[PDB]
Amino acid sequence: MSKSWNHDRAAKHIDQKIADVEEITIKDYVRDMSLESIPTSTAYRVDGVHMYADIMNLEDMLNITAVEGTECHKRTLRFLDQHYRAVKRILNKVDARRVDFHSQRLHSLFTKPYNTESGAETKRVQRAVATAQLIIDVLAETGDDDEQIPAAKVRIGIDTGLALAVNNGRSGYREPLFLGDPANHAAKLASNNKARGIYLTNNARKAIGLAESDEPEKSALTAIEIKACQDAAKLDVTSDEIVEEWREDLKKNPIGGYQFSRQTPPLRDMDIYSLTPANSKRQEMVSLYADIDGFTAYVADHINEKTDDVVRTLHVIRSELERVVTSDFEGRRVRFIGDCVQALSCDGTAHTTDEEKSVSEATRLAGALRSSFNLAIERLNAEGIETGDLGLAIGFDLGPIAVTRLGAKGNRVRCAIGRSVIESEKRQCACSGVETAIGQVAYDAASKAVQNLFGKSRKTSHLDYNEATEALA
Ligand SMILES: Nc1ncnc2c1ncn2[C@@H]1O[C@H](COP(=O)(O)OP(=O)(O)OP(=O)(O)O)[C@@H](O)[C@H]1O
Ligand SMILES: [Ca+2]
Ligand SMILES: [Mg+2]
Ligand SMILES: [Mn+2]
Ligand code: NA
Ligand code: NA
């Protein structure tokens, strides 16, 4: 139960991780290689098309009523589960990779055909567009009126380019994640505003012979443009085939009921990999995002030259931030989303959350994360590893949060959801690489000392562990 950060303990673990990544192997991803269970010391340069599908009406499900109650969460989870199952079936059918499903954003990757084939990149983009429209068509049909579950309102972003594949740091280190421009830029297009449709970067537009746009985020593909991609890609999978299979899956092996229990403290003991709808976890707690600021551009700068230092930097920083969350502060790392850490923190008893204490300890955790980040940069640089212009943006908020695994057996994905999850990320995104921000709900529940620290702006700079300790004395 002790929650404390220590410079010596952090330095020792950072130094050990630096030693582990002394030798790095960078491989160019070609046919017959595998992106599963990538070792710590290895990374793959992947030329691929990234699609991000944003289910825009998630936030509406979370806000059906003023109070964020149990029924709100059960219906939100069933909505995400139904729609995820449909998309995952589509991706399986077209032999694309499901990278992750983070909140309402579903990331997929198209790597085939390979560049040995003439016009491969054009064909990858065409396949991604055709698959995107299949997602849109299907997700109009995968609600359930009887359960008050709406159809999904979909906005899609697509980019093409190079990324660096490393293991995703969770669940036995099996599945990869993909660092660099294309997943990031695809996600930005997908989340830019609330207009439905399929939005390509200028890279992706150029690859399929379309004129570049001064504002790609406002230039949806037309029906005619999409049809050209469909006719070229020849998916030979129809929306009706997907829906019939999706319905059969749910009939034979239904979702069943969502049922919630609290996590026995400490939160680090949550066994996410084992959760199911009937065994979901839920309680008021703090959602925290710690984003390595500037990391995407750093990868882009190094995608071809000095790529090995990227791998060293990523593993040293992410492993240490995870250790601070889990071992120093007894919290739970949910996932990494690209380079960013998604975490949970809680204080209280087996029966109730201590809101004020949870927010104070999250403030201390935020300081500890920054102290460990700063120390990791120092130690990396002292060993001659280039770390560019990296920073750490942190946001956190308080509210009821449910954790489960969505999907059919063999095709599941973890989900942590709540208004405070969504809002903690928005607070994080408002921060520079030296800033830490708090949500309004957390602020309102906080001690006077925490309120004074964050002030009117609900944000502060250079909040390291020493500063947090002194502010909360
Ligand atoms: N490598 C990645 N893989 C998957 N999703 C990503 C990746 N990088 C960013 N994202 C997502 O892309 C969107 C934009 O991320 P963000 O706001 O952090 O961009 P940024 O601040 O420009 O990047 P950085 O923090 O690396 O400087 C978010 O939805 C985020 O979750
Ligand atoms: Ca980042
Ligand atoms: Mg302030
Ligand atoms: Mn960022
Ligand atoms: Na593919
Ligand atoms: Na501890």
Ligand code: NA
């Ligand atoms: Na904690």
